[PDB]
Amino acid sequence: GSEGNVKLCSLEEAQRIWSAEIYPIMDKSSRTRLALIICNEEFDSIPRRTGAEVDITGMTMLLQNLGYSVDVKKNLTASDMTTELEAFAHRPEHKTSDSTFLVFMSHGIREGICGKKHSEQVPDILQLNAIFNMLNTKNCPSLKDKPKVIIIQACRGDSPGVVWFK
Amino acid sequence: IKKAHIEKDFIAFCSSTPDNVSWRHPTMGSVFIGRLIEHMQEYACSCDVEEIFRKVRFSFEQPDGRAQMPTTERVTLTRCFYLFPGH
Numbered sequence: 001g002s003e004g005n006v007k008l009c010s011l012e013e014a015q016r017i018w019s020a021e022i023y024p025i026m027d028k029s030s031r032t033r034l035a036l037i038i039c040n041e042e043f044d045s046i047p048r049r050t051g052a053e054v055d056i057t058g059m060t061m062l063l064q065n066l067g068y069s070v071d072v073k074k075n076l077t078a079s080d081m082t083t084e085l086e087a088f089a090h091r092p093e094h095k096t097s098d099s100t101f102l103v104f105m106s107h108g109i110r111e112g113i114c115g116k117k118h119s120e121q122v123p124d125i126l127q128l129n130a131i132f133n134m135l136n137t138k139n140c141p142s143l144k145d146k147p148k149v150i151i152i153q154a155c156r157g158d159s160p161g162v163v164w165f166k
Numbered sequence: 167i168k169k170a171h172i173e174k175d176f177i178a179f180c181s182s183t184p185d186n187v188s189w190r191h192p193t194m195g196s197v198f199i200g201r202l203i204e205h206m207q208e209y210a211c212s213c214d215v216e217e218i219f220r221k222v223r224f225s226f227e228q229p230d231g232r233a234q235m236p237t238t239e240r241v242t243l244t245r246c247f248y249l250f251p252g253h
């Protein structure tokens with residue numbers, strides 16, 4: 001995929017943006033940042049997501065170029081996803097961390113993200129609210145007052161999202 | 167003991183709008199993920215995540231053949247999240 005070479009910020013620019021309205025950043029000599037990637041490519045019912053490995057190569061490298069330690073978990077069910085999300089938050093590496101990133105790359109509908117065992121008769125849907133509940137200050141005390149970014153790459157329905165005009 | 171907000175300092179970014187589909191290339195990869203990479207590399211030094219994700223949506227503003235609009239949901243960020251690449 002993409003090389004991931006990010007354009008660096010200079011000390012001249014860093015000191016210029018100095019404020020009480022900016023999130024605090026830890027020293028690079030001791031900080032332990034964590035980024036988690038979950039991707040479903042092989043499915044039983046719905047078709048295979050061909051070219052998904054290219055998007056894993058891009059994100060896994062870009063997040064690593066931003067000082068994060070990347071973990072990649074491929075082909076999981078909704079129940080498997082729930083266990084891995086609880087295991088990621090229970091990690092004590094978050095204590096000496098300033099931020100976190102999470103990427104979900106699968107299929108979807110209006111309700112949520114589909115697992116590898118999902119079908120129209122017997123579904124395997126993971127709601128976005130269940131993700132926010134597991135990553136909050138009640139379940140995850142280590143990420144209190146810290147930024148928590150979530151990236152989603154999946155469908156939201158069936159419509160093409162377009163309407164004709166004059 | 168001291169009380170604190172149950173949900174705070176969160177930000178979600180999706181590939182398309184609700185009830186619509188996202189476009190993925192079979193050999194090149196997802197249009198959204200690729201564009202997020204193009205913007206994050208260039209603007210991580212001067213722009214924050216909210217400023218960056220706004221620019222991402224703007225590159226999708228012209229619909230030709232395949233159309234998709236990224237969306238920012240459930241935002242509880244009280245401050246600017248600057249990445250500062252290199253530090």
Ligand SMILES: O=C(O)C[C@@H](CO)NC(=O)[C@@H]1CC[C@@H]2CCCC[C@H](NC(=O)c3nccc4ccccc34)C(=O)N21
Nearest residue numbers: 049106107108153154155187188189190191192197232
């Ligand atoms: O996997 C995901 O998260 C996205 C998924 C949500 O269900 N979306 C999809 O299955 C969408 C909706 C229907 C169609 C299904 C058949 C699979 C491959 C296809 N790809 C392109 O038609 C295509 N996409 C982008 C650029 C292209 C350029 C030239 C030619 C074709 C192109 C594609 O993504 N979808």
